[PDB]
């Protein structure tokens, strides 16, 4: 993306929930129910596994990014100590196997400078909030398609947001 | 024994540790402090050589 219509300066951006990264998708393991039982695949969000992962520029090192974001938008330093449960049930259909597979969803955070109302420099800020699965019902021998297990880029699951203010001096 | 003992002190992790918020205590954790208390004796020593 570029020529924004903002002024020159620094901006934080609220890029939205449900981000999830490329080639991450099966790295937390994978479930295989049949024939009628129900499968349960969840996670508790608390300690490592919610420690964000940064993406710094030479003009936004680390501090800048998680100093400003926390100023804006949620605290993430204290909101990831208390730890928050998720769950995905589903249900496999008779005398058939189903196959469920879980990875996190991120909320990305940008720290983007405009300089004539063009970006020149953009860090990225991923912030673990919670998962995401998805399943398929699978015959023996049967192909899947390469879109379900593996993804190129990162992208996002939901609607895209884009919330920007400016940083003051 | 050499010169150098807080090198496995890394001051970046610990400042990253959150700090502890939910304090589950235990009862019993200290003693009933007794006061130490010292009587200074004098001796008396006598002597015609200084
Ligand atoms: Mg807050």
């Not at chain 2, 890394?10 to 700090?19: M, Q």
């Not at chain 2, 007794?34 to 006598?46: A, F, G």
Request: aromatic share 12%.
């Amino acid at each position: 993306s570029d020529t924004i219509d903002l002024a020159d300066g620094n901006y934080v951006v609220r890029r939205g929930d449900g981000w999830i990264l490329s080639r991450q998708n099966q790295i937390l393991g994978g479930s295989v129910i049949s024939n009628g039982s129900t499968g349960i695949v969840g996670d508790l969000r608390v300690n490592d596994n919610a420690i964000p992962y940064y993406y710094p520029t030479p003009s936004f090192n680390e501090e800048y990014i998680k100093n400003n974001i926390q100023t804006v938008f949620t605290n993430f330093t204290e909101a990831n100590q208390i730890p928050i449960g998720f769950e995905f049930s589903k249900t496999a259909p008779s005398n058939k196997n189903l196959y469920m597979y879980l990875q996190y969803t991120y909320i990305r955070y940008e720290i983007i400078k405009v300089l004539q109302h063009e970006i020149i420099e953009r860090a990225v800020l991923y912030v673990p909030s919670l998962g995401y699965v998805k399943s398929i019902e699978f015959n023996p021998g049967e192909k899947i398609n390469k879109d379900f297990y593996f993804l190129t880029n990162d992208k996002c699951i939901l609607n895209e947001q884009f919330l920007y203010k400016k940083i003051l001096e | 024994s050499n010169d150098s003992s807080l090198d496995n002190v890394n001051i970046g992790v610990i400042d990253n540790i959150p700090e502890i918020i939910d304090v589950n205590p235990y009862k019993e954790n200290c003693d009933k402090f007794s006061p130490v208390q010292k009587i200074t004796s004098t001796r008396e020593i006598n002597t015609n050589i200084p």
